[model samples]
Target: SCGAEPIHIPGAIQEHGALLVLSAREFSVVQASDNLANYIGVDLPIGAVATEANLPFISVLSAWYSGEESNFRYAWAEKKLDVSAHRSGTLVILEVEKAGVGESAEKLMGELTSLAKYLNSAPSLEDALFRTAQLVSSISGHDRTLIYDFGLDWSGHVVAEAGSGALPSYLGLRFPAGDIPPQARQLYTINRLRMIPDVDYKPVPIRPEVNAETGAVLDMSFSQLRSVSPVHLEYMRNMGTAASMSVSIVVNGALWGLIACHHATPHSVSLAVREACDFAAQLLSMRIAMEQSSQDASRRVELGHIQARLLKGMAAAEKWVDGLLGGEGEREDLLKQVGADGAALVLGDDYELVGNTPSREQVEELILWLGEREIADVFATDNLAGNYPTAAAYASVASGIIAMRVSELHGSWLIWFRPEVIKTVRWGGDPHKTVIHPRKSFEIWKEQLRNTSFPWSEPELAAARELRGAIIGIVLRKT
Candidate 1:
């Protein structure tokens, strides 16, 4: 239900600023917020032509429309205002807010340069992320700031945190995917920055409600002051946060995670400060990509060396299976290649197993199942019991598996097994019941996770394929 909500065209914005939608051709105001006069000191009526005499920031709007710039500063009624404009199809959307004091460019750049150096010198990814959290907290002056990393399942984990004790620590806690619905995550990707200075502020509805050109509600997808969903506001209230900000961490063109900041009191950061945080987030994202690629390359190199040794052993042995499963050291190597606890070899009527593995009967049944499923090549799963229900009986020993079919005609197969890793997941709150009504409690809720194992990495799967190819060569020679 939350995913289907049309949040992109809310027809309203937060009350802190004023929004004006003008026709691109005539520069006539098409829609204006009801409280437009409160911020700009002018009650610009709909269909009124905006001019430099009437609207002092009219020059800024013209510059934005003519492809000059998107952000500007204007002095009106002795108060400085921050002006931002963007094109929404046939309409020009303009937003203005009272400007706040910000750090000088020199100061901001010096801090950023220092942060970059610190990140480069950090020893590990964990240390780097923790430092990022600390720097963001110090920059924004939020009561708490944490880096929330998303898991494969879309669940979130608070991997690093920095705070002033105004809010409870969320480090190492998990949150369900439903906490941030699909639509919300989509918005985060489109607009990398979002802030709610005061969650309790009233929403300012855009007059006329519909765009005359598009004959639909305005697409505020990129609006900085777009009114947030009431559900999210309620969630903030429940969490005892009066203000919040989120900066997306994009990696390789995908949403990697978020730098979530929260304040105990209503707080707003200047445009420059927000941009500084965004800059830090971008640098952090690049560093994360570099660290990840470096680690993956290292693993690939290590696995390559192991693969070479196994190929050499296979060439020297009478049978390829002997090279793989003959010596205790060789067996360990085979299992270590994929980080598996056990391995099984099935060729015609012969069946052999090493390390912690399923019983003979269970292995035979698993092979039969694979045959029925028409598994001709590599098949892998971390939760074996989830797909092959029969595996539940031996889940304790083999909850995860990677099966490689050597020859379909000969029924030759090789399988690796990883034991179940039972774990206790500590959630920020009861995630199951927080869909419609936001959860009020912020206490820890533990759930026991079972019948799963560590996922097989891409490198491990590649290693398995290489081993299968080598085995096929040996079998053909023997035949």
Candidate 2:
């Protein structure tokens, strides 16, 4: 094709001396791109953009009145253009030449209108997220778009997907928050809109002198040479992506997450387009937040109702052990919560592995693996001889360990086991090696990760003590 030197055909968007512009402020009912309708073969109206119009501000955000000649006022996230003061208006045509882009302009107007309708009528937060993806895809013609939720532990999970031919499934793929770094999140939070016009374009120069005072890297992480943040780049690359554009989904005034859009080509989004895209993102995020807030409130109430019953069970039964020991299946029920491959009652006074629980020689390997490791950190030792001398992978998995003190008076412990990696194994390189090797790189360095998770990581002794108090209060007194 390159050798063929494809010739341009006349009477196309390129051939016309098209310029994206507003109609004179003195028009009658706005007629949209007469040709755009022919291009799409769909009957749609061009919004009234004249100065004499009397539309409402909300109308601009709700719908473009693409079907109506008469219009209400409106201001949308897309361009912040309010056509209420005018009976007819002129709007920007995107990604096309600046000739008589009436057709492209009209199509954009229709899209803006459609976007508002989608927002106004969105049934739920989930719907809003999907609709937003639809809106961005329609605007940018990108192949994929997704929404990811951020967690406190420097991790993000994908929650939404929309685009052509089934977008790559990352519905639950989790990436660490440290991946984006604090500074990058700041950029999204401050600007609300980010543009990487072309992943392959020459990067804009950062004036070191100016950046020194302001501390803003002119191009920052998303540069032509740089392409993207290291972690983000790795994330996309690992997932088989070519280019990516993302805007944060803000929540409670912080960068809540990102609306990640990706392309397999050297795709670009201009500043003007990004401004519009971000505004749309803002609208969707606001709507979704409202819906989610309402749902959360209801869920909290429902959860409270459920917790009321659990507390009653927890209270009346006295101890988990008592509940299990006394009831027909109570013991099984208690074991269900702590879920171990196998467990045994230990006589604390003698340091005896209680129950015909298993030989200390038999269970010692697994139990010791749990004891030595931190809670929640996994111990995956396929070779029982290596990580665990006498135990299973549970004994070897190096996550934080969850255990209960055996008695109010003695040295017994009730150990609880949790999933390794939370079924969300997120290591940029190899998480297992992080704790072992003190790598200096931000991507895989364990020292950078250590102690950052206070909620998940406390010393085994400290956690054991806390569990002891709970066990004594909940189990000992009851029995």
Candidate 1, residues 81-165, lDDT tens digits: the string is: 7777777788888888877675677877777887799777756889878888988898789999999999888999999999999
Per-candidate Cα lDDT values, in order, are 0.86, 0.45
lDDT of 2 by residue, 87-141 (tens): 2124222112121212364555566666677777857666777777777777776
Tell me the RMSD of model 2 versus the true structure.
14.2
TM-score for every candidate vs. truth? 0.93, 0.48
Looking at model 1, report the run of 10 residues with the lowest lDDT sum: 70-79
Whose TM-score is greatest here? 1
- The weakest ten consecutive residues by lDDT in model 2 span 9-18
Instruction: List candidate 1 segments past 4 Å from native.
Output: 68-78, 102-105, 374-376, 472-479
Q: What is the Cα-based TM-score of model 1?
A: 0.93
- TM-score for candidate 2, residues paired by index: 0.48
- lDDT score at residue 109, model 1, on the 0-100 scale: 76
